[PDB]
């Protein structure tokens, strides 16, 4: 089983979506969840450290999800940190670019709690958690 004290960073431009994701994570047993409004704030909070999983939106102001993922992978201290990508449009080119950047998973809005739980379980199994 995955560690229930794992710290999650939810990054999205909409506060309501972040609250929904936090509630879904709480229903799954994860209570250590922090929220970020854009890529810059997400990177600033990542520089603090202590996070074990990232859920980030694709299109965000001042930094999109792809650039944030590239910056995370470029950092040695956070290159192995799993990142979950949530988007509104599942274009093949964007998915391929994210996979080349090192995305751990992909979620398409709208989605159900079952899909999110399945994605989290698959990511944890791939990482051996």
């Amino acid at each position: 089983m995955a560690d229930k004290e794992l710290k999650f960073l939810v990054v999205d431009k909409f506060s309501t979506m972040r609250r929904i994701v936090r509630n879904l994570l709480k229903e799954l047993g994860f209570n250590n969840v922090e929220e970020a409004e854009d890529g810059v704030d997400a990177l600033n909070k990542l520089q603090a450290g202590g996070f074990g999983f990232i859920i980030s939106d694709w299109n965000m102001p001042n930094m999109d999800g792809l650039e944030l993922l590239k910056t995370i992978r470029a950092d040695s201290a956070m290159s192995a940190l799993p990142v979950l990508m949530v988007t509104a449009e599942a274009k093949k080119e964007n998915i391929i670019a994210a996979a080349q950047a090192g995305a751990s998973g992909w979620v398409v809005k709208p989605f159900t709690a079952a899909t999110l739980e399945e994605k989290l379980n698959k990511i944890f199994e791939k990482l051996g958690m």
């Binding site: 999205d12 909409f14 309501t16 979506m17 929904i20 879904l24 939106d57 299109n59 509104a88 449009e89 809005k109 709208p110 989605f111 159900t112 709690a113 079952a114």
Partner: protein, 83 residues
Amino acid sequence: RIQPYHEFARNLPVPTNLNLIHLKPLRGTGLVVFSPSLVFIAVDNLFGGDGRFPTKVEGREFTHTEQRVINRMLKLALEGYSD
């Protein structure tokens, strides 16, 4: 399909428009669930949308005009259900 409430909640896409209704004289609260895709299609049709450019759900809250459209759709649905 008949299933426990938690299973029904687990299979509802999020975010979504949830409407609480009452079926008098029966006791309890009913739910009318409107998917964001249907709401966007109705908004497109009402405001001259050609339908060639579907709107992707970004996870945002419905606007006041969208809320009024949902209102109208729900009123029609409740009238049909009652009839």
